[PDB]
XYZ file of C-alpha atoms in Angstrom:
605
model
C 237.483 145.011 -5.173
C 235.640 147.016 -2.526
C 237.024 150.229 -1.022
C 236.122 151.342 2.506
C 237.088 154.149 4.883
C 238.327 153.236 8.369
C 240.273 156.185 9.767
C 243.488 158.173 9.723
C 246.489 158.775 11.961
C 249.589 160.954 11.715
C 252.611 158.900 10.640
C 255.387 161.107 9.205
C 255.303 164.809 8.298
C 259.049 165.549 8.352
C 259.392 165.465 4.561
C 260.635 162.722 2.273
C 263.163 162.626 -0.562
C 263.591 158.852 -0.973
C 261.526 155.890 0.200
C 262.587 152.526 1.607
C 261.335 149.671 3.769
C 262.915 147.214 6.207
C 261.450 143.695 5.854
C 264.016 141.767 7.922
C 263.232 142.753 11.525
C 259.804 144.350 10.849
C 261.139 147.745 12.002
C 260.563 150.318 9.262
C 263.765 152.085 8.212
C 262.859 155.783 8.181
C 264.511 158.011 5.570
C 264.917 161.454 7.146
C 267.190 164.436 6.567
C 268.057 164.492 10.294
C 268.086 160.784 11.192
C 265.421 160.702 13.912
C 263.070 157.723 14.195
C 259.410 157.956 15.228
C 257.085 154.937 15.309
C 253.471 155.131 16.507
C 251.069 152.206 16.844
C 247.728 152.638 15.112
C 245.362 150.094 16.650
C 246.271 150.381 20.340
C 248.660 153.341 20.200
C 251.237 151.762 22.511
C 254.799 153.044 22.250
C 257.254 150.583 20.698
C 260.438 152.697 20.708
C 261.279 155.783 22.795
C 264.884 156.748 22.032
C 266.500 159.576 20.036
C 269.715 157.836 19.001
C 271.854 160.345 17.082
C 275.628 159.909 17.220
C 276.295 162.540 14.528
C 273.145 164.366 13.398
C 273.002 166.237 10.116
C 273.740 163.312 7.787
C 271.407 162.255 4.986
C 270.036 158.820 5.913
C 269.625 157.446 2.376
C 268.736 153.764 2.013
C 267.091 152.149 -1.013
C 264.777 149.134 -0.795
C 266.050 146.714 -3.449
C 263.143 144.290 -3.852
C 264.847 142.001 -6.390
C 266.383 139.942 -3.561
C 264.745 141.793 -0.626
C 267.907 143.495 0.646
C 268.507 147.117 1.664
C 271.860 148.875 1.226
C 272.087 151.698 3.762
C 274.242 154.622 2.604
C 275.501 157.492 4.764
C 277.489 160.597 3.856
C 280.870 158.889 4.421
C 280.950 155.276 3.187
C 278.748 152.388 2.027
C 277.033 150.238 4.637
C 276.882 146.555 3.673
C 275.172 145.350 6.853
C 275.155 141.613 6.128
C 275.122 139.995 9.564
C 273.935 136.496 10.483
C 270.863 135.594 8.396
C 271.302 138.901 6.554
C 269.861 141.184 9.226
C 270.154 144.967 8.994
C 270.713 147.829 11.428
C 268.116 150.553 12.032
C 269.537 152.608 14.916
C 272.953 152.988 13.221
C 271.468 155.332 10.593
C 273.643 158.168 11.960
C 276.757 156.245 13.057
C 279.767 156.830 10.803
C 283.321 155.466 10.627
C 285.430 157.179 13.264
C 288.317 159.587 12.712
C 289.816 159.387 16.223
C 289.166 157.676 19.547
C 287.365 160.813 20.787
C 284.342 160.228 18.536
C 281.023 159.146 20.041
C 279.991 155.674 18.852
C 276.506 154.164 19.129
C 277.065 150.415 19.428
C 273.324 149.641 19.661
C 273.678 145.872 19.706
C 270.409 143.942 19.301
C 268.661 142.212 22.181
C 270.519 138.960 21.438
C 274.138 140.053 21.880
C 273.325 142.744 24.458
C 271.616 140.112 26.613
C 274.518 137.733 25.957
C 276.857 140.403 27.342
C 274.471 140.860 30.276
C 274.636 137.121 30.992
C 278.428 136.982 30.618
C 278.687 139.957 32.996
C 276.261 138.962 35.753
C 274.747 135.481 35.299
C 277.213 133.356 33.310
C 280.466 134.965 34.498
C 281.047 137.633 37.152
C 283.669 140.093 35.885
C 282.795 143.020 38.162
C 286.481 143.506 39.076
C 287.458 144.790 35.613
C 287.828 148.406 34.517
C 284.672 150.090 33.240
C 282.324 147.296 34.336
C 280.424 149.622 36.675
C 279.761 152.253 33.999
C 278.497 149.742 31.423
C 276.282 147.968 33.962
C 274.978 151.354 35.124
C 274.109 152.276 31.531
C 272.309 148.968 30.975
C 270.356 149.214 34.233
C 269.512 152.870 33.547
C 268.032 151.861 30.203
C 266.153 149.018 31.883
C 264.756 151.362 34.550
C 263.730 153.885 31.890
C 261.891 151.101 30.058
C 260.378 149.716 33.287
C 257.566 152.283 33.174
C 256.498 151.028 29.725
C 257.262 147.356 30.451
C 253.725 146.968 31.830
C 252.518 147.070 28.199
C 255.230 145.395 26.106
C 258.938 144.572 26.038
C 259.445 146.024 22.544
C 260.405 149.291 24.261
C 263.402 147.532 25.799
C 263.872 145.790 22.447
C 264.292 149.014 20.455
C 264.704 151.927 22.908
C 268.135 150.508 23.641
C 270.731 151.941 26.000
C 272.739 154.802 24.487
C 275.935 152.745 24.307
C 278.179 155.782 23.840
C 280.723 154.613 26.413
C 284.325 155.766 25.860
C 286.428 153.464 23.707
C 288.921 152.880 26.539
C 286.295 151.235 28.768
C 285.145 149.034 25.886
C 288.763 148.171 25.056
C 289.489 147.158 28.653
C 286.305 145.077 28.904
C 287.025 143.359 25.581
C 290.621 142.618 26.584
C 289.533 141.166 29.933
C 286.828 138.989 28.364
C 289.150 137.778 25.589
C 291.899 136.939 28.089
C 289.456 135.063 30.328
C 287.932 133.135 27.409
C 291.286 132.324 25.762
C 293.456 131.416 28.766
C 291.225 128.390 29.423
C 290.174 128.138 25.736
C 286.546 127.677 26.810
C 284.110 127.717 23.881
C 281.163 129.331 25.648
C 278.477 131.260 23.762
C 280.282 134.485 24.743
C 283.325 133.514 22.650
C 281.858 134.861 19.358
C 280.834 138.058 21.155
C 284.342 138.582 22.530
C 285.851 137.739 19.136
C 283.581 140.232 17.357
C 284.318 143.005 19.862
C 288.069 142.417 19.558
C 287.678 142.346 15.765
C 285.983 145.751 15.886
C 288.680 147.081 18.224
C 291.562 145.864 16.044
C 289.986 146.681 12.651
C 288.166 150.003 13.101
C 291.531 151.737 13.610
C 293.429 152.049 10.298
C 296.566 153.021 12.231
C 296.555 149.719 14.160
C 295.525 147.534 11.206
C 298.304 145.089 10.209
C 299.018 143.717 6.730
C 297.863 140.491 5.083
C 300.137 137.453 5.109
C 299.577 136.203 1.555
C 302.311 134.101 -0.020
C 303.695 130.589 0.405
C 306.528 130.221 2.877
C 305.403 133.221 4.948
C 304.000 133.162 8.481
C 300.782 134.779 9.707
C 300.170 135.982 13.250
C 297.613 134.013 15.262
C 295.829 137.086 16.676
C 294.091 138.173 13.454
C 292.414 134.798 12.823
C 289.379 135.632 14.985
C 287.936 136.727 11.628
C 287.512 134.198 8.805
C 288.466 136.770 6.145
C 292.132 135.732 6.307
C 291.213 132.140 5.448
C 288.750 133.194 2.747
C 291.293 135.486 1.044
C 293.715 132.643 0.232
C 291.411 131.075 -2.398
C 293.235 132.650 -5.339
C 294.240 129.732 -7.582
C 292.141 126.812 -6.350
C 292.160 124.376 -9.312
C 289.202 122.183 -8.256
C 286.533 124.798 -9.014
C 285.475 122.691 -12.004
C 284.258 120.086 -9.527
C 280.548 119.307 -9.348
C 279.726 120.599 -5.853
C 283.039 122.324 -5.010
C 281.905 125.689 -6.317
C 284.010 128.702 -5.225
C 281.466 130.449 -2.995
C 280.110 127.356 -1.146
C 283.629 125.983 -0.652
C 284.984 129.286 0.676
C 281.910 129.547 2.914
C 283.118 126.415 4.728
C 286.079 128.270 6.215
C 289.277 126.734 4.851
C 292.472 128.328 3.551
C 294.539 127.021 0.637
C 298.119 127.966 -0.205
C 298.654 127.895 -4.000
C 301.169 125.119 -4.596
C 301.713 122.120 -6.844
C 301.850 119.762 -3.853
C 298.658 118.866 -2.026
C 296.364 119.802 -4.903
C 293.384 118.067 -3.260
C 294.875 117.691 0.229
C 292.465 118.667 3.013
C 293.367 120.335 6.316
C 290.774 121.743 8.722
C 291.004 123.799 11.924
C 289.203 121.760 14.602
C 292.027 119.239 15.048
C 294.458 119.952 12.153
C 293.848 116.451 10.790
C 295.776 115.697 7.593
C 293.075 114.694 5.103
C 293.136 114.027 1.359
C 290.854 113.386 -1.629
C 288.866 116.523 -2.278
C 286.186 115.271 -4.661
C 283.364 116.767 -6.752
C 280.820 114.902 -4.608
C 282.696 115.858 -1.408
C 280.545 118.798 -0.352
C 282.615 121.066 1.944
C 280.044 121.202 4.758
C 279.290 117.484 4.445
C 283.019 116.704 4.441
C 283.572 118.998 7.432
C 280.901 117.112 9.381
C 282.254 113.770 8.134
C 285.847 114.359 9.250
C 284.997 116.654 12.183
C 281.586 116.229 13.871
C 282.825 118.287 16.846
C 282.833 121.496 14.791
C 280.365 124.006 16.311
C 278.900 124.629 12.849
C 277.614 121.038 12.882
C 275.737 121.324 16.185
C 274.625 124.933 15.659
C 276.321 126.237 18.805
C 277.432 129.877 18.771
C 281.143 129.368 19.439
C 283.581 131.009 16.998
C 280.828 131.142 14.366
C 281.806 133.417 11.468
C 279.781 132.398 8.376
C 280.260 133.759 4.856
C 278.051 136.807 5.464
C 279.916 137.758 8.646
C 283.244 136.903 7.002
C 282.637 139.204 4.020
C 280.803 141.922 6.001
C 284.013 143.220 7.625
C 285.637 144.812 4.570
C 287.300 148.169 5.340
C 286.501 151.454 3.630
C 288.549 154.473 2.579
C 287.579 158.129 2.371
C 287.374 159.370 -1.255
C 288.037 163.070 -0.632
C 288.540 165.298 2.394
C 286.377 168.113 0.967
C 283.837 166.609 -1.433
C 283.031 170.040 -2.845
C 280.934 168.497 -5.629
C 277.209 168.581 -4.928
C 274.904 165.621 -4.309
C 271.843 165.897 -6.561
C 270.465 162.515 -7.666
C 271.575 158.874 -7.656
C 270.213 155.385 -7.121
C 270.940 151.677 -7.152
C 267.911 150.345 -9.029
C 266.553 146.816 -8.715
C 269.916 145.149 -9.456
C 271.529 144.168 -6.133
C 274.281 142.227 -7.931
C 275.856 145.500 -9.104
C 276.612 147.824 -6.185
C 275.526 151.311 -7.293
C 276.383 153.993 -4.713
C 277.118 156.963 -6.968
C 279.687 159.122 -5.163
C 279.386 162.329 -7.196
C 282.355 163.854 -5.330
C 284.760 162.950 -8.142
C 286.062 159.448 -7.397
C 283.955 156.329 -8.012
C 285.327 152.835 -7.354
C 283.331 149.628 -7.847
C 284.306 146.421 -6.038
C 282.755 143.164 -7.216
C 280.719 141.294 -4.612
C 281.823 137.897 -5.943
C 285.541 138.651 -5.594
C 287.498 140.000 -2.637
C 288.157 143.707 -2.180
C 291.606 144.791 -3.380
C 293.445 147.882 -4.569
C 292.958 148.098 -8.333
C 294.136 151.331 -9.970
C 295.289 154.896 -9.326
C 295.390 157.475 -12.114
C 294.595 161.048 -13.134
C 292.392 162.051 -16.066
C 293.822 164.201 -18.845
C 291.847 167.398 -19.428
C 292.472 167.342 -23.210
C 290.777 164.097 -24.250
C 289.749 164.495 -27.922
C 287.094 161.745 -27.848
C 284.307 164.074 -26.691
C 285.275 166.757 -29.218
C 285.376 164.111 -31.961
C 281.899 162.913 -30.971
C 280.597 166.494 -30.998
C 282.140 167.274 -34.398
C 280.937 164.025 -35.987
C 277.405 164.901 -34.837
C 277.322 167.890 -37.191
C 288.877 179.718 -24.947
C 286.987 176.512 -24.121
C 288.124 174.291 -21.241
C 286.624 170.797 -20.961
C 286.990 168.691 -17.813
C 285.418 165.400 -16.744
C 283.571 165.172 -13.416
C 282.586 161.613 -12.499
C 279.082 161.620 -11.011
C 277.397 158.223 -11.407
C 278.211 154.767 -12.763
C 275.300 152.620 -13.934
C 275.468 149.096 -15.372
C 272.310 147.941 -17.163
C 271.930 144.614 -18.958
C 269.172 142.194 -19.920
C 286.752 143.622 -28.262
C 286.594 145.624 -31.498
C 284.551 147.595 -30.807
C 284.908 147.420 -27.027
C 281.734 146.569 -25.067
C 280.102 149.865 -24.123
C 276.995 150.676 -22.111
C 274.543 153.589 -22.041
C 276.183 155.219 -19.013
C 275.435 158.944 -18.987
C 276.865 161.616 -16.729
C 275.588 165.002 -15.599
C 277.804 167.455 -17.481
C 277.532 170.895 -15.851
C 279.055 173.396 -18.283
C 277.548 176.801 -19.077
C 277.892 178.603 -22.408
C 276.417 181.894 -23.646
C 273.355 181.781 -25.876
C 278.086 183.620 -32.016
C 277.282 180.492 -29.989
C 274.067 178.814 -28.844
C 274.086 176.860 -25.586
C 273.284 173.184 -26.173
C 273.493 170.118 -23.931
C 274.260 166.658 -25.315
C 274.696 163.434 -23.312
C 277.957 161.549 -23.805
C 279.199 158.052 -22.989
C 282.609 157.519 -21.379
C 283.845 154.181 -20.042
C 287.063 152.884 -18.503
C 288.910 149.618 -19.106
C 286.831 146.991 -17.309
C 289.104 144.216 -18.602
C 291.503 143.712 -21.495
C 289.952 141.576 -24.248
C 292.807 139.083 -24.470
C 293.105 148.934 -29.519
C 292.138 151.748 -27.139
C 289.652 150.502 -24.509
C 286.331 152.288 -24.236
C 285.637 152.759 -27.955
C 281.935 153.536 -28.320
C 279.873 151.173 -30.477
C 276.599 153.074 -30.879
C 275.003 155.791 -28.742
C 271.282 156.331 -28.158
C 270.276 159.998 -28.248
C 267.453 161.393 -26.138
C 264.463 162.771 -28.086
C 264.392 166.415 -29.130
C 261.787 167.454 -26.556
C 263.554 165.480 -23.815
C 266.727 167.501 -24.401
C 264.669 170.690 -24.795
C 263.631 170.722 -21.122
C 266.997 169.350 -19.884
C 265.332 166.597 -17.861
C 267.752 164.752 -15.576
C 267.656 161.028 -14.785
C 266.804 160.921 -11.078
C 266.910 157.111 -11.052
C 267.068 154.116 -13.388
C 264.695 151.166 -13.052
C 264.665 148.354 -15.642
C 261.313 146.963 -16.719
C 259.934 143.764 -15.212
C 260.416 141.737 -18.401
C 263.943 143.131 -18.803
C 263.666 143.652 -22.566
C 262.873 147.384 -22.595
C 264.392 150.162 -20.496
C 262.474 152.556 -18.245
C 264.147 155.902 -17.525
C 263.154 157.986 -14.524
C 262.700 161.739 -14.791
C 262.260 164.590 -12.328
C 261.631 168.337 -12.374
C 263.307 170.629 -9.862
C 261.053 173.252 -8.182
C 248.740 164.479 -19.285
C 251.813 162.255 -19.253
C 254.589 164.603 -20.314
C 258.000 164.096 -21.918
C 258.959 160.421 -22.198
C 261.404 158.138 -24.010
C 260.598 155.011 -26.027
C 263.111 152.879 -27.938
C 264.027 149.243 -28.590
C 267.194 147.148 -28.328
C 267.867 144.122 -30.537
C 268.705 140.745 -28.977
C 268.285 138.402 -31.960
C 271.793 137.850 -33.342
C 274.394 135.701 -31.598
C 276.527 138.773 -30.851
C 274.907 141.648 -28.971
C 273.737 144.324 -31.417
C 271.513 147.405 -31.395
C 268.422 148.447 -33.325
C 268.982 150.950 -36.129
C 265.558 152.661 -36.221
C 263.201 154.049 -33.558
C 259.718 152.550 -33.457
C 257.633 155.212 -31.705
C 258.418 158.361 -29.713
C 255.856 159.479 -27.127
C 255.407 163.273 -27.296
C 252.406 164.471 -25.286
C 251.667 168.189 -25.701
C 251.285 168.606 -21.932
C 254.642 169.432 -20.308
C 253.022 171.055 -17.254
C 251.888 167.719 -15.762
C 255.061 165.712 -16.421
C 255.171 162.532 -14.344
C 257.482 162.952 -11.359
C 257.511 159.292 -10.288
C 255.965 156.095 -11.620
C 256.102 152.324 -11.195
C 255.751 149.441 -13.645
C 253.971 146.208 -12.741
C 253.368 142.948 -14.632
C 250.043 142.654 -16.485
C 248.729 140.262 -13.814
C 248.635 142.424 -10.669
C 246.615 145.634 -10.764
C 243.435 145.329 -12.826
C 240.804 142.629 -12.404
C 240.731 142.137 -16.177
C 244.536 142.091 -16.139
C 244.450 139.659 -13.205
C 242.021 137.383 -15.056
C 244.206 137.519 -18.185
C 254.934 143.389 -20.201
C 255.585 147.117 -20.549
C 253.825 147.735 -17.227
C 251.016 149.999 -16.092
C 251.271 153.796 -16.173
C 249.356 155.585 -13.405
C 249.640 159.376 -13.283
C 249.028 161.733 -10.364
C 247.506 165.180 -10.895
C 247.844 168.271 -8.721
C 244.051 168.365 -8.419
C 244.013 164.989 -6.679
C 242.206 163.122 -9.459
C 243.403 159.524 -9.817
C 243.747 158.298 -13.407
C 244.272 154.594 -14.127
C 245.819 154.022 -17.560
C 247.359 150.973 -19.220
C 250.850 151.712 -20.542
C 250.394 149.025 -23.212
C 247.848 151.176 -25.073
C 247.766 154.555 -23.240
C 244.038 154.031 -22.647
C 242.169 155.679 -19.772
C 240.330 153.128 -17.624
C 238.820 154.933 -14.622
C 238.898 158.211 -12.701
C 238.777 158.649 -8.916
C 238.044 161.971 -7.223
C 240.336 163.113 -4.385
C 239.048 162.975 -0.800
C 238.373 165.952 1.466
C 240.476 166.771 4.516
C 238.628 166.791 7.835
C 238.637 169.969 9.928
C 240.725 171.970 7.452
C 240.339 172.710 3.746
C 244.040 172.139 3.011
C 244.777 169.633 0.254
C 245.335 166.080 1.525
C 247.862 165.042 -1.107
C 249.668 161.703 -1.241
C 253.440 162.142 -1.378
C 254.861 158.634 -0.805
C 254.726 156.097 -3.638
C 257.022 153.055 -3.687
C 256.817 149.313 -4.323
C 257.573 147.306 -1.169
C 257.889 143.548 -1.632
C 257.238 143.094 2.089
C 253.746 144.606 1.869
C 252.952 144.763 -1.882
C 250.713 147.784 -1.293
C 250.637 151.317 -2.692
C 251.793 153.384 0.277
C 250.360 156.863 0.817
C 251.605 159.215 3.545
C 250.478 162.839 3.701
C 252.236 165.999 4.841
C 249.168 166.832 6.944
C 249.419 163.585 8.894
C 246.668 161.320 7.559
C 246.528 157.698 6.417
C 244.083 155.713 4.299
C 243.805 152.038 3.369
C 242.631 150.744 -0.020
C 241.178 147.244 0.319
């Protein structure tokens, strides 16, 4: 494993609080406190993107690279961005675009090259619609962007690919253009490739306004308007009591992906009815795969041939769910949160007071509205059983980690911020509070057994910046941070031997290093067959610590044994420390990233 020096180049010196990567379109998602994007080529130095797209600057662009399934969930200061488009592509330039409050807001459409060029074709090459309102302004914007790129087109077209036109046109022009295109494409019912584009634009126009959003027509014997169907969500929402789920290949998700709608009724239990020609079919069967059956009874469906005409797959169908604003003020601070490596559970901890979790498998619906009593005796009972005053609950983060009487409870801790004088002595103790996930058909949320942090861990009041389960999934790794050799750590075991889930009754070992000054700020855990050559030739992971002096220490977490030491390099031209600040595991590259505040890069072969 040779190591060589090649060179360095400034990449990012704007500061970093969280790290992420974008593996879909090979355009690195930059996490910045402002939202600006800067990309510089290293080998040739050619510019790939020259555009400062900022619809509403000042928002924290926080996205986390979930490498379990290689998906990134972008989160802004307002809502949660589940950008699941066709083939699961993501958006980079919309890092500062937020849901609108009025029609006066500035929106950055920033469509990719595909749909932007499709609009260009439908406006000049395919169809000529120059007589509509706002056509001149949009064409002028597109040609202005093209002319701006034309100077850099002599090198590459990626400038036009990413330095897109600032599509901040007023919503009235876009509304008029969308209405004209939809009318033209629906009066003759022509299924050209521009039909999905027109449908998507009209869907945005009719859904992004909560005031103009109609209701859902759910219920037998009730009619549904034909205008809202340009999204498949209406069809997918009717699969409430489908009784053929127990079929072999008629699983809920694949069958709903096909694009049918079923009214719950005793008649027509397995009756089939599609949309292409409204043919009355029968005999839904376990071996009757929905896509295969759709091709069998309707080969003219555009899904069969792959044409882009009224194509709304499951990802596009379920990626149009609306969002609601939790609070108008949000006076509660934002300190630390994360989603972990568990994409199945959506973890966007809104520490503003209200946290609602919607299951990905099921459809989004209104669930519950309530207010919390300020005199709950459960916490006081827990405190008293361990051994003037106003106690209130502030919901900060919900975390679900996994490998009745009592009710199933989970080690979900919250950041209690209450100050007491230190006759009383100020002490902080984590607590576990859970709501009623589902009735087990007593009082829901009864704690089974709580795991207490070690004495030294509570002594320094370390806060869990993030939670990351171990690779094997048996043991739990807890992240720690310190606000401005190992340190203070936690080590316990959970029992998974009995048929019913239980918990261990005795700690095994507690790691207490008498060196709190150099507490680990961040760390990663890797299987025993990645890092070391001996390990490669051969489950708790590998513990590598970083020192302020720049020395690199390689230790094996299995035995806490020091393996090798590497001296820090020397900065060129200046004596300032060339420290590595970025450390994150990217499944796209599988390398240990290292970006410096001074603007230098190094590669470890």
